[PDB]
């Protein structure tokens, strides 16, 4: 399907295998759509983490598992100025 163009909201607190559990709710009406996922550094530049969820999609108006990069990162759910950016701090490596 086409990519989700609208924004998302956190259903609950982000849960912390080292990975994080993100529970989202879609705010748009263009479903079925694929959830855009990306990770950024403390400056907002592309800084690759790792999306665990094989194919995160919105069936109707979704649990996202991902391993954040070590240190400071921004977990981006969606595209553009609308996009939900989760500033995350991962301690270590040990």
């Amino acid at each position, epitope marked *: 399907y086409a990519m989700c163009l609208n924004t998302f909201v956190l259903k*609950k607190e982000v849960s912390e295998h080292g990975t994080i559990l993100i529970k989202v*709710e879609y705010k748009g009406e263009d479903a079925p759509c694929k959830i855009p996922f990306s990770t950024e550094d403390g400056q907002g530049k592309a800084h690759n983490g790792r999306l665990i969820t094989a194919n995160p999609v919105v069936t109707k108006k979704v649990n996202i598992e991902a391993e954040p990069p070590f240190g400071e990162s*921004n977990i981006v759910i969606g595209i553009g100025d609308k996009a939900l950016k989760i500033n995350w701090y991962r301690k270590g490596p040990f």
Partner: single-chain antibody, 228 residues
């Protein structure tokens, strides 16, 4: 579709107890938090507390400790509000509300008639604005309202005899179906709601609300009226 069905009006004696229900349909009650909000006649919104039905965790505003109790039934997809030793001060409309990043879904409310920490500074208390002009409502928090670098500040519109409606969530995001004339902005402790241009439909009471950490405190409210 997605609906929050509340139980009928209650006429209770002073000193007695009452249980109100909030039946959730079109969604799993465990997916997000469930809050209860108190509104005394002609007064502001008062966040009672919230429940996480997946683990049964409850959090309350200290003002409702020893008065209110919140439970959830995950087999019937229902949330409950328990009120103890009722007084005239408990006479109010009680709303159940779903969510964290702004309450998009509210119940119709339940009237309860009893027979005979962060500070949210919302300004102005009353606002008279001419048609086609700009109306700005301010909300000042005593502490930080940020979580994951996002300001957990939400705005609500409340018209006569109606439950509140979500306008803005996460300080600046417009809720689906809300016109472009409504806008929100803010960072740190200062937040604003702008209605430009103002029309006759905008005559309502407006409320700001934080949700990053408990209590999920509402502002005192802004009654918006039309002048010449």
């Amino acid at each position: 579709v997605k609906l929050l069905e509340q139980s009928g009006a209650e006429l209770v004696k002073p000193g007695a107890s009452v249980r109100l229900s909030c039946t959730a349909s079109g969604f799993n009650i465990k997916d997000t938090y469930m809050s209860w909000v108190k509104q005394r006649p002609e007064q502001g919104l008062e966040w009672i507390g919230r429940i996480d039905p997946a683990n049964g965790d409850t959090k309350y505003d200290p003002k409702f400790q020893g008065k209110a109790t919140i439970t959830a039934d995950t087999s019937s997809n229902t949330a409950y509000l328990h009120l103890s030793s009722l007084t005239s001060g408990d006479t109010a409309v009680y709303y159940c509300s779903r969510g964290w990043e702004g309450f998009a879904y509210w119940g119709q409310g339940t009237l309860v008639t009893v027979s005979a920490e962060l500070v949210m500074t919302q300004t102005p208390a009353s606002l008279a604005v001419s048609l086609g002009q700009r109306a700005t409502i301010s909300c000042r928090a005593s502490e930080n309202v940020d979580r994951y670098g996002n300001s957990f500040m939400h705005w609500y519109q409340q018209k006569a005899g109606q439950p509140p409606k979500l306008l803005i969530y996460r300080a600046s995001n417009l809720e689906s179906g809300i016109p472009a004339r409504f806008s929100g902005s803010g960072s740190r402790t200062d937040f604003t709601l702008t209605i430009n241009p103002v029309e006759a439909d905008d005559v309502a009471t407006y409320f700001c609300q934080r949700s990053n950490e408990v209590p999920w405190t509402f502002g005192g409210g802004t009654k918006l009226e039309i002048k010449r």
